[PDB]
Amino acid sequence: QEEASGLKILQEWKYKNAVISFPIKTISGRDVGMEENYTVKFENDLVGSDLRIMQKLKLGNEMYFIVSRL
RNA sequence: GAAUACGUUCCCGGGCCUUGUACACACAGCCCUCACACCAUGGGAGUGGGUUGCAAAAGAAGUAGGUAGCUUAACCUUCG
Numbered sequence: 001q002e003e004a005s006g007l008k009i010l011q012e013w014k015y016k017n018a019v020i021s022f023p024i025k026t027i028s029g030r031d032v033g034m035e036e037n038y039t040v041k042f043e044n045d046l047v048g049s050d051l052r053i054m055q056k057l058k059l060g061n062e063m064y065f066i067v068s069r070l
Numbered sequence: 071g072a073a074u075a076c077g078u079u080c081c082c083g084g085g086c087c088u089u090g091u092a093c094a095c096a097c098a099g100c101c102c103u104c105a106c107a108c109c110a111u112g113g114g115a116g117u118g119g120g121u122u123g124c125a126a127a128a129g130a131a132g133u134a135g136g137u138a139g140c141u142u143a144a145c146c147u148u149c150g
């Protein structure tokens with residue numbers, strides 16, 4: 001819906017934690033890049049506000065995210 | 071050491087020929103996946119003038135006109 005506008009929603013819904021996953025169906029080094037961006041848009045953009053991270057996994061076909069706020 | 075193919079519609083492989091083709095190493099052709107950057111174009115709240123047009127107001131210099139104030143060497147002086 002917009003270019004680089006993800007950090008907005010979590011905050012709007014006043015909260016504490018979450019769980020956020022994505023597909024990891026990289027076909028033996030094919031979907032690399034075209035599927036490894038649901039992440040690098042986090043760690044990069046996640047310095048500055050009340051948002052933080054708790055844990056991270058990558059098994060099966062879904063990589064769940066755990067988030068924290070103060 | 072002998073009971074003895076009635077028959078070639080049939081990709082061990084080739085010739086004659088025909089239409090195409092998403093063909094020239096030369097035969098076959100209807101997405102499942104994405105924040106997509108960054109240079110080029112089409113826009114585009116407002117800003118701003120250029121050059122100003124338009125409804126006017128005000129009008130510096132100069133040029134011209136009027137003019138009872140004021141002032142003055144050549145001319146006429148009647149001589150006021």
Ligand SMILES: [Mg+2]
Nearest residue numbers: 081082083084
């Ligand atoms: Mg053949």
Ligand SMILES: [Mg+2]
Nearest residue numbers: 121122123124
């Ligand atoms: Mg003008």
Ligand SMILES: [Mg+2]
Nearest residue numbers: 131132133134
């Ligand atoms: Mg004058």
